[PDB]
From a paper:
Epstein-Bar virus (EBV), a member of the subfamily gammaherpesviruses that also includes the Kaposi Sarcoma-associated herpesvirus (KSHV),2,3 is the first identified oncovirus. Similar to other members of the family herpesviridae, EBV has a characteristic three-layer configuration: the outer lipid bilayer envelope containing viral glycoproteins responsible for host recognizing and membrane fusion, the inner pseudo-icosahedral nucleocapsid enclosing a 172-kb double-strand DNA (dsDNA) genome and the middle pleomorphic tegument compartment fulfilled with 20–40 different viral proteins. All herpesvirus capsid shell consists of 4 abundant proteins: the major capsid proteins ([name]) constituting the basic capsid skeleton through forming 150 hexons and 11 pentons, the small capsid proteins (SCP) binding to the tops of hexon MCPs or both hexon and penton MCPs, and the Tri1 and Tri2 forming the heterotrimeric triplexes to plug the large holes on the capsid floor. Once the viral dsDNA genome enters the procapsid shell through the portal that is located at a unique 5-fold vertex of the icosahedral capsid, the viral nucleocapsid is joined by the capsid-associated tegument complexes (CATCs).
Residue numbers in the entry:
A (entry chain W): 5 to 50
B (entry chain S): 1037 to 1148, 1174 to 1381
C (entry chain 6): 1 to 159, 172 to 301
D (entry chain 5): 9 to 65, 83 to 139, 150 to 238, 256 to 363
E (entry chain T): 199 to 395
F (entry chain S): 51 to 344, 364 to 395
G (entry chain 7): 1 to 32, 38 to 191, 200 to 227, 237 to 301
H (entry chain T): 1185 to 1234
């Protein structure tokens, strides 16, 4: 909802930013996010 | 606000999120890690769905108990500890009185959703001569104490007698047979309400606390060995469970996701809540915690004991 | 495509229970989830059919309609393995059910609540506190009369009832248990049938009454044996009208749609379309209809 | 040719395994190859995911497609791909044009004569021509035979553009996917105010899939279109929608004349297709040049349209 | 507190969280004038009320591995600042104790970023600049088969933060257990402008 | 006027391992794997307890052997990974142009992030089933403060000692439950009460057990064998280091048993590590070319409760990275 | 999968038999391998009375098959599965146009035995193929042969109330999607008609028993001629009447479900075939 | 705010809302007009506290 | 009625609802909001706190004497102990309660 | 049975130097 | 003896074994 999904080279940081994420996206801390479960969790077509 | 001929014994089961501690000594269980394997499950034209399976055998070495799990502290009391009672017109929707004009007037003078779980509390009819000293200590909500765990294993015939045969006195109070005969007997009023033999027309999804005290099938479950009734406690029985976060309390449909254990189903005793008879004994309980009167001429106050020492605040007068 | 569920026990299955489950291999079992590894508490029909409450079969029919079906192929210690039933595959289902209905005609089968009793298909686990009940698999000509006996016992509780209580077959008669109260959803189905009938009674034709009158007074068929040579008066006062074709044609179109809706209402439970049944091997190659 | 040979040689079925039972030394190397095939088609490696793409021709089925010849003014180019289209039955035998409707151009066939309405009349501003497509709307809804003259033909997967006499291609039966071999997923787009979830109005067993049902229904003001999502079966959702249609049985009571057979039927339910229940429908927003309406996005659709069954 | 968020925010969790808000507001708000209720454990109470303040803050950001600020006495990252007033600074430098360090080692200049030759083409052409175009070219053109690990992508997260000279800047450092936060006040910056802090 | 992309980031999934965590202190990993091959899930032990040779003429002190049978628990651990088919269509299609080479590298990286997802899911499901085994055979401490006390048992389980044992359970349910809540309302004796309760758990757990061997899972500083493991939550882990205050080792343990799983445990995890997934896919791409032409430190805080030096490990971070309840 | 089913012809087929089997090669037919009970020809034999309901129950019980190739000794045919599709054609001499209809119904041929058959003189069997027709045409011909059987048996008993030309004017023609067909209306269809008759006779007392089972709400919707039946009837007679009526209602509802209902996608009127799957 | 004299003092010794019903902010629902407004104004249901 | 984190976000990010003007004589609702920075839980959780209300001066001079064993309700009067999040020192003569 | 908890190291064949069947 | 029961029971022959 305001997010693009391109096959970017994603820099691999080491932060613990998984903690309280699936509950934080449900309440709406993030203004715009895309949840990709299953086949959508892919480095998309160029 | 005029007394009817009977009194009640309100029973609620109150859930608690408790942070646990698990000890388990070394070389407790031996293991065999199998190699993991892959197999496709739902080969849809859009996306092939795989599956990664794994099997392992955990053989328990120790002939003693190699683990103890204690509750370390309470995180929060997840329930209400409230007043919300059970609606028998929702549990038993097929039963009705004679006149549909008087059967609809009744359903109108009684109940025909915000905050946490309401702790749906049952009600047991009990005479007004039940001594308050029975209710000031942890007992069964019916009259007789159900010390069936103490008796011999796999013996249903004799151990029905110590629950229901009133010719012999209590396990606890051997100068009386029951503190109420209207719930403690084999076909009594509290028994026809809450046993499974007479709840054949009830709605199966709803939850009743007194099923942990009146159901003969699970009361005779604890008749077996003490080294079996501590196994069947912690072996994920879920014999008398409840829904965790549901707004309206229900029984779980064989839930393995939640983690709970019920010690009131093992040793068969409910703990007294903080009850009173007037607001004045409540106001005097906070003023002097030691020298408060449990009885003032006709009124009583029942100080709450529990595994959790819940701390009370009325304004600024705190008790611990 | 791996279609195989490994339902795992928590506790150890005793040897007599292993023999009782090995006696039932190939039978239909309904599952809670469609996934590869499940638990026992949720396998079978026991979560809807419990000992504590009344046998209500209409919610069991909708449970068998909704949830998936699986056959039992392998039973061992601590685990019993099932094979799901998907459209497009042919499955071998053996007749291991205690009221024995012989599938000689290779008719389409039907999956039933255990209306004949629990305790013959109750098969009991003393490992873990659960009861696995196996649904009855039987042809749809028996299934329609069992469902009509279920629906008719509740309306004939008020006003010979042993004929409605038991079943009729070619070889034998078996006793199926009826409750004194059907339940909420059985009463809902009886209520929907009552509303359908009380609406459709005015949308009945008029011409066939003249047929049944002239056929009673003229020529007795084998099918005309129910009246015991008697006609009521409601037939007469709806035969004080003259016959046309236009209102009857519109009434027969709405009668077609209402009989299709009644076909939707009576068709409860899964049906299996058998092909090449082997009576000597006692198994049947079936798929989901 | 080298590109074509390198592209065909990778996209080839693997040969079937032979066991020469007759000879001695051939049986040993053939079962050697058999265990070397299983051991690399089962374990966690890239070899077991390499094996899944060969497809070995029961599991995968190339679907059927409906080549429909429509008018360009009765359609819109700016619509999304996964719109469930509804073909209208034509009275003339040799017609050549199959008048289909997107849910918005059918929503303007609903409302013109009496959110969704904003984007509907933004996409299809002039409704006189679309009321001229159907020969009779008010009489056909008066005798309530509109549900059988409207048949669904599944979601649109390919719309080739043409200024006059447009041509569309929908999956009528089978796994919903695009037509161009540069491959993409056709996500079924359903507007949200017509979409209701039946568990929400219901307020215990896990199925295999959660189906999508369209229900053309005959409200007393005009027709209404509602897309029903149910995990249950067809003959079960007939009973569930009988529970849901509570004031309709009161209206059919309060129209007490039984010889007027028009108010004795209240719509019909057709099953559109089967999407998976473990992955629920995703909400999304579909934008025009000016407006944006919230649209249900449904992926992994397997279209199989059923008959209209009378409530 | 992740034991109250482990299940979803159901209608019942979002009720006892609102109860716990009012409970914490009644009980543990204003931790510095209720620290005077005891005299002995002032230091441990303030140290615990600040050590439970650096734990509620999620310090896990993507620029955590980029060492930009260090303590001048020993090599250890700072881990954040407390911004207090002058009175609370005067009370938290005696009761919490004299500061372990008086200065921190931070950068001396802004880590600049200009639209260079590769991003000028896409600024003028598309109007989409990226940050470190050379690292995108290093990741997908020059050997795209080498996927980045944590350590291999550390000079790409530290864009210009690392290659700088590090002057020391004065800040009262307070060591809250293993962290070494840097408390300070900005009321000298606001009082001579005649503006409220 | 441009639109800056200020950087683009992803998280590194931490590789948890069952032999890296301290939950494997309480488990011995046998390299036998014949109890999976064995048909029946039982194993029969001929244990033999000692006896006290009594002298009075009561009864002859016959020898004691017990033929005990331990049934093995077989658990099935299964995840799934829905992988798109147009990833497979690029996996089999050999790339020639650099854009399809980048798209094919992206397809391999999507595939190698699903095999890694499966291996990372079966090293969390393994810890989950092991922790649920240790929570299923864990009777509570209000039972085993007395059932594991022999001064009440071993006189013969009659009706009377069981009737007193239940009333003794009901005391420890009230005056002993939630022991870390009584320690907050305790006086200056914070540490000694908590150390007493933890030592009482270690004393009530530790008894007789079959199949013993060498001193496995030693620590590195003291060199003492580690008796057990205290699986706690993270808040209790924070509280047991301000009450107890210290650790016997600096979160280091030295198990030399982890020597055959630094080989058998690595050639699955590093066999899907995108260095071998890309290698095997290049190998199959070469086949498509061939086609038309024809010991260690363990992070675990070790506390000393009397003579045993148990470990305290919290798997709260393991479950909070799943958004699954601990 | 391997789906080619062959049947065992005893005698070799002659030239006119080859032509008549080639003429209807695209049509479907049931299955029982024996050529004796190969299809519906054992219900439409001269051995049994041509009863509709047993024919329908046999047609809904046994599987279907669309044939691909014909020879002098073999009949190549593939049976029907619920999985995949087969291309079938409309080769029936009562010709009904499959223009854009998403459903096809398989019913016994009520337009006469000769209209949809091949008579094999040389062999032992005379085969018939069922009617594959769109479902509004199917329910319309069910209406116009059911009501014609009723309105014919009525004027055979009493011709004073109705008229034969009045029912033959409307009940002999179907009109679906502008096509006007004629019905060959001539025994047949008598048991289904009398089943419907028994249902609508006993449905008043059925509705009364149902509304007395559970008040004036459901008693207002009958009219006054549709309400009054006296409250005196024996228990065994009422129970047997209700049981037999509900049995005939269930059979009649599953019978007015028109059997194996085929579904089509792309009807190509140039080649007269449509892609057809089982539903 | 004008209240009757029969409003009990146990309501006023705690920190409740100054009107009668407890107006719950997020405890009711999420984006509705019949559950939040119901739990705020509809007195056919008792408030969540008492 | 929006979700929890989207209420926590809008609680601090702006003066989310109904502030009073400070440093005036009478309380006005703010219109400027430039230098007026204040947070407010009374709109976050919609509950007011009790004040030290006493029905008569007898109970409020007995709250100072014994602040633990005082009667919250004496026959027809009452005293209501303030529970507000700022603990305020009450000093009546030399009798100091907290 | 007899092997309800026991492993078996080997077996004893009934003098059959090349046959695996029998006791 | 035709198996690998060395790590299962233990190294000592007086404590455990086959």
């Amino acid at each position: 909802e305001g997010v693009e999904n391109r096959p970017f080279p994603y820099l691999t940081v080491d932060a613990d930013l998984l903690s309280n994420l699936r509950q934080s996206a449900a309440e709406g801390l993030f203004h715009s996010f895309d949840l990709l479960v299953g086949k959508d969790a892919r480095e998309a077509g160029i | 606000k005029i007394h009817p001929g009977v009194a009640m014994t309100v029973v609620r089961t109150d859930e608690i999120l408790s942070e646990n501690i698990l000890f388990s000594s070394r070389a407790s269980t031996s293991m065999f890690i199998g190699t993991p394997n892959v197999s496709r499950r739902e080969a849809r034209v859009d996306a092939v769905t795989f599956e990664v399976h794994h099997e392992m055998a955990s053989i328990d070495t120790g002939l003693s108990y190699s683990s103890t799990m204690t509750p370390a502290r309470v995180a929060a009391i997840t329930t209400d500890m409230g007043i919300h009672t059970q609606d028998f017109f929702s549990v038993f929707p097929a039963e009705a009185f004679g006149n549909q004009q008087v059967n609809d007037y009744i359903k109108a003078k009684v109940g025909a959703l915000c905050h946490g779980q309401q702790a749906t509390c049952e009600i047991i009819v009990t005479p007004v001569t039940a001594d308050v000293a029975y209710f000031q200590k942890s007992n069964s909500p019916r009259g007789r104490a159900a010390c069936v765990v103490s008796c011999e294993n796999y013996n249903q015939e004799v151990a029905e007698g110590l629950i229901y045969d009133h010719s012999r006195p209590d396990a606890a109070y051997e100068y009386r047979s029951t503190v109420n005969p209207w719930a403690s007997q084999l076909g009594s009023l509290g028994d026809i309400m809450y046993n499974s033999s007479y709840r054949q027309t009830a709605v199966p999804g709803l939850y009743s606390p007194c099923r942990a005290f009146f159901n003969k099938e699970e009361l005779l479950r604890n008749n077996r060995g003490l080294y079996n009734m501590v196994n069947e406690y912690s072996q994920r029985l879920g014999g008398h469970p409840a829904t965790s976060n549901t707004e309206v309390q229900f029984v779980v449909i064989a839930g393995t996701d939640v983690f709970l254990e019920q010690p009131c189903s093992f040793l068969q005793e409910a703990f007294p809540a903080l009850s009173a008879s007037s607001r004045a004994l409540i106001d005097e309980f906070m003023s002097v915690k030691q020298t408060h009167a449990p009885i003032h001429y006709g009124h009583y106050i029942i100080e709450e004991v529990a595994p959790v020492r819940r701390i009370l605040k009325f304004g600024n007068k705190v008790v611990f | 495509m791996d279609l195989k569920v490994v339902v795992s026990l928590s506790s150890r299955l005793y040897t007599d229970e292993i023999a009782k489950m090995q006696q039932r291999i190939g039978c239909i079992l309904p599952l809670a989830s469609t996934h590869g590894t499940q638990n026992v508490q949720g396998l079978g029909l026991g979560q809807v059919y419990s000992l504590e409450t009344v046998p209500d079969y209409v919610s069991m029919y909708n449970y068998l309609s909704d949830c998936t079906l699986a056959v039992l192929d392998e039973v061992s210690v601590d685990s019993l393995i099932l094979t799901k039933i998907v459209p497009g595959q042919t499955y071998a289902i053996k007749n291991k059910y205690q009221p024995f209905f012989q599938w000689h005609g290779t008719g389409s089968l039907s999956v039933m609540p255990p209306v004949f009793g629990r305790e013959h298909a109750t098969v009991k686990l003393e490992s873990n506190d659960v009861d696995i009940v196996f649904p009855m698999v039987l042809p749809t000509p028996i299934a329609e009369e069992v469902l009509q006996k279920i629906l008719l016992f509740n309306v004939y509780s008020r006003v010979v009832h042993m004929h409605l209580g038991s079943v009729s077959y070619l070889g034998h008669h078996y006793e199926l248990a009826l409750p004194e109260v059907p339940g909420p959803l059985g009463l809902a189905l009886l209520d929907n049938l009552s509303l359908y009938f009380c609406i459709m009674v005015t949308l009945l034709p008029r011409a066939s009454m003249r047929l049944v009158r002239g056929l009673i007074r003229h020529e007795h068929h084998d099918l005309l044996n129910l009246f015991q040579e008697m006609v009521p008066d409601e037939i007469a006062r709806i035969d004080l009208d003259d016959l046309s074709v236009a209102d009857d044609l519109s009434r027969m179109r709405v009668m077609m749609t209402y009989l299709q809706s009644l076909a939707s209402l009576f068709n409860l439970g899964p049906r299996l379309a058998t092909a090449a049944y082997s009576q000597e091997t006692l198994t049947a190659t079936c798929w989901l209809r | 040719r080298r590109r074509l040979q390198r592209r065909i040689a990778g996209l080839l079925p693997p040969p079937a395994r032979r066991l020469n039972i007759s000879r001695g030394s051939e049986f040993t190397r053939d079962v050697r190859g058999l265990v070397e095939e299983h051991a690399q088609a089962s374990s966690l490696s890239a070899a077991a995911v390499w094996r899944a793409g060969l497809l070995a021709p029961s599991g995968w089925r190339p679907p059927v497609f409906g080549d429909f010849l429509i008018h360009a003014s009765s359609f819109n180019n700016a619509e999304a791909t996964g719109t469930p289209l509804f073909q209208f039955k034509q009275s003339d035998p040799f017609s050549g044009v199959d008048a289909v409707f997107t849910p918005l151009s059918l929503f303007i066939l609903m409302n013109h004569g009496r959110g969704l309405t904003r984007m509907a009349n933004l996409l299809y501003d002039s409704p006189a021509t679309l009321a001229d497509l159907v020969p009779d709307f008010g009489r056909l809804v008066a005798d309530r035979r509109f549900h059988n003259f409207i048949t669904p033909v599944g979601p649109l997967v390919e719309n080739i553009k043409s200024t006059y006499l447009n041509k569309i291609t929908t999956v009528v039966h089978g796994p919903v996917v695009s037509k161009a071999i540069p491959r993409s997923t056709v996500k079924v787009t359903v507007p949200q105010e017509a979409f209701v979830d039946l568990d929400a109005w219901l307020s215990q067993p896990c199925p295999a899939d959660a189906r999508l049902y369209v229900a053309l229904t005959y409200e007393e003001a005009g027709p209404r279109f509602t897309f029903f999502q149910s995990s249950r079966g067809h003959c079960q959702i007939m009973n569930i929608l009988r529970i849901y249609y509570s004031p309709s049985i009161m209206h059919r009571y309060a129209v007490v004349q039984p010889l007027h057979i028009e108010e004795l039927t209240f719509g019909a339910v057709a099953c559109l297709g089967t999407f998976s229940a473990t992955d629920g429908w995703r909400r999304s927003a579909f934008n025009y040049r000016g407006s944006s309406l919230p649209v249900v996005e449904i992926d992994s659709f397997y279209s199989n349209v059923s008959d209209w069954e009378v409530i | 507190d992740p034991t109250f968020t482990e299940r979803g925010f159901s209608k019942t969790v979002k009720s006892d969280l609102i109860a716990m808000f009012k409970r914490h507001l009644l009980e543990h708000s204003f931790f510095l004038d209720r620290a005077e209720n005891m005299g002995s454990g002032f230091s441990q109470y303030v140290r615990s009320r600040l050590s439970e303040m650096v734990a509620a803050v999620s310090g896990e950001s993507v620029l955590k591995g980029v060492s930009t600020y260090t303590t001048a006495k020993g090599g250890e990252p700072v881990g954040g600042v407390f911004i207090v007033t002058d009175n609370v600074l005067r009370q938290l430098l005696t009761f919490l104790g004299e500061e372990a360090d008086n200065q921190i080692m931070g950068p001396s200049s802004y880590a600049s970023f200009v639209v260079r030759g590769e991003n000028l083409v896409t600024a003028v052409s598309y109007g989409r600049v990226m940050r470190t175009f050379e690292h995108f070219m290093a990741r997908i053109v020059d050997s795209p088969e080498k996927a980045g690990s944590t350590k291999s992508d550390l000079p790409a997260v530290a864009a210009g933060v690392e290659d700088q000279p590090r002057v020391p800047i004065s800040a009262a450092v307070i060591k809250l257990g293993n962290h070494a936060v840097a408390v300070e006040s900005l009321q000298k910056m606001y009082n001579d402008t005649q503006s409220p802090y | 006027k441009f639109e800056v992309l200020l950087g683009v980031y992803t998280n590194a999934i931490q590789y948890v391992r069952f032999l890296e965590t301290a939950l494997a202190v309480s488990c011995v990993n046998t390299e036998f794997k014949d109890l999976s091959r064995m048909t029946d899930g039982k194993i029969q032990f001929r244990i033999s307890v000692p006896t006290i040779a009594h002298g009075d003429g009561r009864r002859p002190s016959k020898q004691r052997t017990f033929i005990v049978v331990k049934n093995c628990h077989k658990h099935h651990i299964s995840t799934e990974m829905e992988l798109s088919m147009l990833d497979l269509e690029i996996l089999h299609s050999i790339p020639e142009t650099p854009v399809e080479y980048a798209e094919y590298v992206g397809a391999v990286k999507t595939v190698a992030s699903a095999l890694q997802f499966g291996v990372d899911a079966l090293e969390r499901g393994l810890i989950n089933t092991v922790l649920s085994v240790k929570l299923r055979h864990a009777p509570p401490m209000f039972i085993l403060q007395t059932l594991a006390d022999p001064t009440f048992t071993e006189r013969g389980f009659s009706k009377t000692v069981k009737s007193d044992l239940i009333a003794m359970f009901k005391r420890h349910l009230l005056e002993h439950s939630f022991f870390l809540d009584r320690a907050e309302n305790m006086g200056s004796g914070f540490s000694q009460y908590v150390r007493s309760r933890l030592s009482e758990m270690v004393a009530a757990v530790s008894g007789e057990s079959v199949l013993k061997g060498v001193s496995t899972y030693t620590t590195a500083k003291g060199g003492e064998p580690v008796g057990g493991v205290f699986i706690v939550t993270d808040n209790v882990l924070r509280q047991l280091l301000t009450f107890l205050g210290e650790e016997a080792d600096n979160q280091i343990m030295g198990p030399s048993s982890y020597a055959s799983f630094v080989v058998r445990g690595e050639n699955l995890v590093t066999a899907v590590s995108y260095g071998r997934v890309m290698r095997t896919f290049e190998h199959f791409m070469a086949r498509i070319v061939d086609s038309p032409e024809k010991r260690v430190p363990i992070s675990a805080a070790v506390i000393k409760l009397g003579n045993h030096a148990v470990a305290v490990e919290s798997l709260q971070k393991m479950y909070n990275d799943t958004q699954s309840p601990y």
